[PDB]
Design a binder for this molecule. Structure first.
Ligand SMILES: O=P(O)(O)C(O)(Cn1ccnc1)P(=O)(O)O
Ligand SMILES: O=P(O)(O)C(O)(Cn1ccnc1)P(=O)(O)O
Ligand SMILES: C=C(C)CCOP(=O)(O)OP(=O)(O)O
Ligand SMILES: C=C(C)CCOP(=O)(O)OP(=O)(O)O
Ligand SMILES: [Mg+2]
Ligand SMILES: [Mg+2]
Ligand SMILES: [Mg+2]
Ligand SMILES: [Mg+2]
Ligand SMILES: [Mg+2]
Ligand SMILES: [Mg+2]
Lengths: 346, 346
C-alpha cells in the first residue's frame, strides 16, 4: 500500500535522474555519443522491475525523519539515493544475466542479448555502477552522511561480489557435484549475493540520511534485514523453476546452470538413494528432457509444499525479529517491506 | 632508472596487499572459498605488467614530500595506493580482453580464456575494482586526502568507462564503416579510455597524498599527462599490429575488431581512392588473408615511418609542456614517466 502510493512519484523522478546524468557531461560534446548510449542503457536496464529497493529507501526515509525536516531538497536526495540502489540493481543484474546465460529479464530480452549489444554489456554494466557515484556527488557532496553513503555502496557491492563468486564456484558448468549443495553453503551464498544489497543497503541508506548512524542500530536493522534477504532469495530460487516466466519476467535457468538452488538443496535432504542418482544424472545439463526429470523429482518430494511451509515458518521468524530488534525504529519500516514480498510471484 | 630501483620494492610489497585483502574477511570462514578465488584472481591479473602506473604513484610521492615526512607509515600508503592504481588496471584489462576477444595478456592466456573461468571473469573483474576501495579504507581511512582519493578513483573509472563505450561504439563488429575513423574521434576516444586512468590518476593520487590539492596545480599536471596518455595509446595501437606478440605479451586484434586505431586513421588520410576501397574490403574481418592485406597498405603508405616521426614530434611537444606546466612540481616527475615510455616495444 505504501510502496503503492509512492511508486509513481518514484518512477516519474527517473526522467530527472537521466537528465542530470546525460547533461553533466554534455558540456563535453566529444563524448556525446557515449553519453547517448548511457541514456539508452539506463532506460533499458533501470526500468521495469518492482522498485522495491528504491521505494524502500524513499519510504524508509519518510518514516525516520521528522516532517519538519522532510523539506524539498532533502526529499529529493531520498529518491536519488533510492535510484542509486536501483542502479546497483541494474549493474549486478546485467552482469548476472550474462554469467547465468539468461534469456529474459523484466519481461524483455536481456541487455546482453539485445542484438548490437552482447559482451559490450560488460562495459555498460560498469557504467551503471559509475552513475551511482555520479549522483551521490551531484546531490549529497555536502551532506554529513556523504562519506557514509559512498562506503555503504562500495561495501555492499564488494559483499554481493563475494556472494556472486560464492554462487559461481558452487555451480561449475560441466562439473555436476551435489555434495557441495548443502545448507551452510546455501545460507552463505544468499547472504552475500542478495541479502546485503537488497535489504540492508536501502534501509541503511535511509538511516544514514536521517542521522541514524549508531553502530548498534545498524547492527540490529541488519539482523532483521539479512533474514529477509534469505527468505527473498529462496522465494526467487523457487520461482526460478515453479513460476510463470511471463510473470516473473525471466526464464529460469538454475537447474541447467548447476546452481546451488534452495530446491536442489532441500531435494538432496529428502533424497532416497534411487532419486539421488536420478538427480546426479540430470542436474546441470541443458537437455530439456533431463531438466524436467529434475522438476519431477522435486514434485515427487512435494517440495512445492515444503516451500509453502518454509514461507510461513520463515515469515513468522522475521516477524519475531521485527518484534525483537526494530526499535527505536518504526516497525512500519520492516513490516512494510516484508509485506511487499510475502507470497510474491514476481 | 628511477622506476628500476623502485620496481623491486614495489613488487615485493604485493605479498602484503594480498595478505591484507585475503585475511580481513577470513574471520568469516564461510566466504573462505570466495576469498580463495580472490587471491587466485589477484595473482593472475595484478602481476606481470610493467607497473608503470603503480611505480609512478610511488616515485611521484618521494619527489613531492619532504623526506622529513616520508616516514614508515606514510611510505606504505604510497605503494598501497600505487597498487590500487595497479588494480584499476587489472579491473579494466580483464573486462577489455573479454570485450576485444583477445587471446593473451602479459604473455599468458587471458583470464577469461583460462579454462574453468570464461565469463565469470566479469565478476572477477568487478572484485578487483572492489579491492581498490578495500585497501583505500584499510590504509587511508584517516588521512585528510581519504575522500579525495575515493573520488579520484571513481571519477577516473567513469572516465575510462565513457572512453571504452566511445571505443566500442566506433568499432561495431560486422559494421565496417571507415567514415567514423577520423581524428577528432580518435583523440576523444584515447583521452577517456587511456589518458585519465594511466597518467593523471597516478600523479594526482601522489599529489593529493602530498597535500597538493590546488585546482590549478592538478589542472596543469593534467594538461601534461593527458598529452602523454594520447602518445601512449598511439604507441599501443602501433604495437598492436607492428610489435612482436612474444614481447608485447599480447596478440593484437585491432584490425579484426574493426577498431578506430591510430594507423587506420592515418591510413584513411593518405588513402588514394583505390587503396580506400581495399581498406573498405578487408578491415574488421577475422580472415587472416584480409587482415594482412590491411597491414600491407599500411606498409605501402610507410605508416611505420609516420609513426616514428609522430613519436619524435610528439615527444618534443610533451617536453615543451613539461617546460611550460610542470612547476611548482619537480620536472623530474614528468620526465621520469615520459622517459619510461619513449620508443617502448612492450
Ligand atoms: O537467481 P540469481 O541469484 O541468478 C538472481 O536472483 C539475481 N541475483 C544475483 C544476486 N542476487 C540476485 P536472477 O533470478 O534474478 O537471475
Ligand atoms: O588497445 P586497447 O585500448 O584495447 C588496450 O590498450 C587496453 N586499454 C583499454 C583502455 N585503455 C587501454 P590493449 O591493447 O592492452 O587490449
Ligand atoms: C536478488 C534477486 C532475486 C534479483 C532480482 O530481484 P527483484 O526481482 O526484486 O529485481 P526487480 O526486477 O524487481 O529489480
Ligand atoms: C592503455 C593500455 C595500453 C593498456 C595496457 O597498458 P600497459 O601495457 O602499460 O599495461 P601493463 O601490462 O604494463 O599493465
Ligand atoms: Mg545468479
Ligand atoms: Mg540470474
Ligand atoms: Mg534467481
Ligand atoms: Mg580495447
Ligand atoms: Mg584490448
Ligand atoms: Mg591496444
Amino acid at each position: 500500500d505504501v510502496y503503492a502510493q509512492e511508486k509513481q512519484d518514484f518512477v516519474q523522478h527517473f526522467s530527472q535522474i537521466v537528465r542530470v546524468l546525460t547533461e553533466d557531461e554534455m558540456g563535453h560534446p566529444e563524448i556525446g555519443d557515449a553519453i547517448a548510449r548511457l541514456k539508452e542503457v539506463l532506460e533499458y536496464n533501470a526500468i521495469g522491475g518492482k522498485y522495491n529497493r528504491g521505494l524502500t529507501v524513499v519510504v524508509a526515509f519518510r518514516e525516520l525523519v521528522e516532517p519538519r525536516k522532510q523539506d524539498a531538497d532533502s526529499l529529493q536526495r531520498a529518491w536519488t539515493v533510492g535510484w542509486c540502489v536501483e542502479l546497483l540493481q541494474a549493474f549486478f543484474l546485467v552482469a548476472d544475466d550474462i554469467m547465468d546465460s539468461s534469456l529474459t529479464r523484466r519481461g524483455q530480452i536481456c541487455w546482453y542479448q539485445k542484438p548490437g549489444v552482447g559482451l559490450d554489456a560488460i562495459n555498460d554494466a560498469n557504467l551503471l555502477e559509475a552513475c551511482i557515484y555520479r549522483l551521490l556527488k551531484l546531490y549529497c557532496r555536502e551532506q554529513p552522511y556523504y562519506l557514509n553513503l559512498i562506503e555503504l555502496f562500495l561495501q555492499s557491492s564488494y559483499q554481493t561480489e563475494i556472494g556472486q563468486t560464492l554462487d559461481l564456484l558452487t555451480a561449475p558448468q560441466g562439473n555436476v557435484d551435489l555434495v557441495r549443495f548443502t545448507e551452510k553453503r546455501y545460507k552463505s551464498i544468499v547472504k552475500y549475493k542478495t541479502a546485503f544489497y537488497s535489504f540492508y543497503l536501502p534501509i541503511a541508506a535511509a538511516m544514514y540520511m536521517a542521522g541514524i548512524d549508531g553502530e548498534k542500530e545498524h547492527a540490529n536493522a541488519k539482523k532483521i534485514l539479512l533474514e529477509m534477504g534469505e527468505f527473498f532469495q529462496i522465494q526467487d530460487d523457487y520461482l526460478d523453476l515453479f513460476g510463470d516466466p511471463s510473470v516473473t519476467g525471466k526464464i529460469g535457468t538454475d537447474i541447467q546452470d548447476n546452481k546451488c538452488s534452495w530446491l536442489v538443496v532441500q531435494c538432496l535432504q529428502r533424497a532416497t538413494p534411487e532419486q539421488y542418482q536420478i538427480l546426479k544424472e540430470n542436474y546441470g545439463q541443458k537437455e530439456a528432457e533431463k531438466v524436467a526429470r529434475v522438476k519431477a523429482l522435486y514434485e515427487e518430494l512435494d517440495l512445492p509444499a515444503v516451500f509453502l511451509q518454509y514461507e510461513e515458518d520463515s515469515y513468522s521468524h522475521i516477524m519475531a525479529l521485527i518484534e525483537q530488534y526494530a526499535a527505536p525504529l518504526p516497525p512500519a519500516v520492516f513490516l512494510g517491506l516484508a509485506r511487499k514480498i510475502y507470497k510474491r510471484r514476481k
